[PDB]
Amino acid sequence: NNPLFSPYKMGKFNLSHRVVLAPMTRCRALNNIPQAALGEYYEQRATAGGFLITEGTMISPTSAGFPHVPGIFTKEQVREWKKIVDVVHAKGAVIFCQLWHVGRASHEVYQPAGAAPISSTEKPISNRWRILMPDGTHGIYPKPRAIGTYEISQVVEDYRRSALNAIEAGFDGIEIHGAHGYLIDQFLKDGINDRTDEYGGSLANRCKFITQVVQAVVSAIGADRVGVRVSPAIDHLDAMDSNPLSLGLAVVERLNKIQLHSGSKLAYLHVTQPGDGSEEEEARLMRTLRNAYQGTFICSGGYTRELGIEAVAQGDADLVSYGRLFISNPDLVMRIKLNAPLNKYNRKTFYTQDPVVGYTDYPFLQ
Ligand SMILES: Cc1cc2nc3c(=O)[nH]c(=O)nc-3n(C[C@H](O)[C@H](O)[C@H](O)COP(=O)(O)O)c2cc1C
């Protein structure tokens, strides 16, 4: 009866249901190397024909702003990801790697040689926000270095090489992290991008970086293995746009044009929202971006079982991603299918390093 359990064709991938694991940073990938613990964690959540998105994954030595997040820029990282991808595929699941650059949302402790983080801008995140340090304290975001356009093209190549590494590890595809005030969003949002060259100012200029990143990974691995995540109206790390709907529609137009020029559709567009009870206004934004995009749409942010069912039933979205409920409900798909009670999550262990505690020790349904 439940449309969340109707099958869906995501490009080449035949999904058996519409419940998606949203990407979440958990900081168990010690020294940026995927660990056996990650394999247990993703395997617990994998289902036959279900779609998983990994935690954000570094594309370069300078792309991190969290401790013990995995990378996919070295061959050592590729070898260890392969072991995780294999156990997920042994469950019949489809898995994409999220490619993540934090831009100015970093700190000397996270950068090679303690160098400054990079951004569209030379302005620091304001002291309204604090960065989680490796010792569990909260530190001050430093002044970033505004990069020139050659360096922009080098970052684009980091995305491209990371996408090829993800394919080498056996991932089904990659997702571009263009959300939450990180590097791509620092170019998109006119509340951050103060550039006066061809990457700042107009909507077209502000959309150049995400267009070039998506085009590069499309050319390398094929559009149907590329998803794109954005958040036009999440206020995180001083990310704000004067006209969020207009910015979101401008991004969607770029994606439609990339598809037209390459003769193929992307895997999906993934839009995430605050989702913390603004409900009607947020729902209208989500539906407006979905209606403008020629392809598969994943909605994200505060969805419940009931709101996910409604989203698919009403044609508002094709797939529904869940984040926090998947932390504490490894069998979330099954609980949603059965309408079984959901278990709470322990916020304290979202970002700790233990390979079991708060990570793989949340039980299945009895
Ligand atoms: C601990 C935690 C880590 C997260 N890490 C990421 C991440 O690496 N990349 C990303 O795009 N979103 C990340 N998110 C955001 C989630 O993917 C999701 O969009 C958000 O939690 C809202 O969905 P929900 O209400 O279902 O939890 C994270 C969220 C949490 C709580």
Q: What is the CATH number of the domain that holds 278?
A: 3.20.20.70
Q: Is 146 left (phi over 0), alpha (psi -120 to 50) or beta?
A: beta
| Residues whose CB is less than 8 angstroms from the CB of residue 11 and which lie 6 or more positions away in sequence, other chains included | 224, 225, 265, 266, 267, 296
Measure 277 CA to ligand 1 centroid, in angstroms.
17
Backbone angles phi, psi at 239, to 5 degrees: -80, 110
Residue 365, in any domain of the structure: no
Distances (CA, A) of 237 to 106, 183, 196, 240: 11, 11, 22, 9
Atom of ligand 1 nearest to the CA of 302: 25
Residue 355, in any domain of the structure: no
Task: Look up residue 295 and give its two tokens.
Answer: 């392809």
CA nearest 251: which of 224, 269, 227, 275? Answer: 269
Q: Is 263 left (phi over 0), alpha (psi -120 to 50) or beta?
A: left
Residue 366, in any domain of the structure: no
Residue 361, in any domain of the structure: no
Residue 358, in any domain of the structure: no
The letter for the amino acid at 227 is: G
Task: Look up residue 238 and give its DSSP letter.
Answer: T
Residue 357, in any domain of the structure: no
Residue 141, in any domain of the structure: yes
Measure 180 CA to ligand 1 centroid, in angstroms.
10
Atom of ligand 1 nearest to the CA of 229: 11
Measure 258 CA to ligand 1 centroid, in angstroms.
27
347 is in an annotated binding site: no
Catalytic residue of the set 8, 110, 182, 268: 182
DSSP codes joined into one string, 180-202: TTSHHHHHH-TTT----STTSSS
Domain that holds residue 189: 3-349
Sign of the Cα pseudo-torsion (320, 156, 101, 47, in order): positive
* Residue nearest atom 2 in ligand 1 by C-alpha distance: 24
Domain count, the chain: 1
Residue 281, in any domain of the structure: yes
* Residue nearest atom 14 in ligand 1 by C-alpha distance: 24
Is residue 41 part of the annotated active site? The answer reads: no
Atom of ligand 1 nearest to the CA of 55: 8
28 is in an annotated binding site: no
Backbone angles phi, psi at 321, to 5 degrees: -100, 145
Ligand 1 surroundings by CB, under 6 angstroms? 22-25, 55-56, 98, 177, 179, 229, 272, 275, 300-303, 322-324, 350
Measure 207 CA to ligand 1 centroid, in angstroms.
23
287 is in an annotated binding site: no
Q: Tell me the structure's resolution in angstroms, rounded to a single decimal.
A: 1.5
User: In which residue are the tokens 């700790």 written?
Assistant: 352
* Residue nearest atom 6 in ligand 1 by C-alpha distance: 24
- Is residue 351 within 8 A of residue 24, CB to CB? The reply is no
Q: Which residues of 139-163 are buried (b: 16+ CB within 10 A; e: fewer)?
A: eebbebebbeeeebeebbebbbbbb
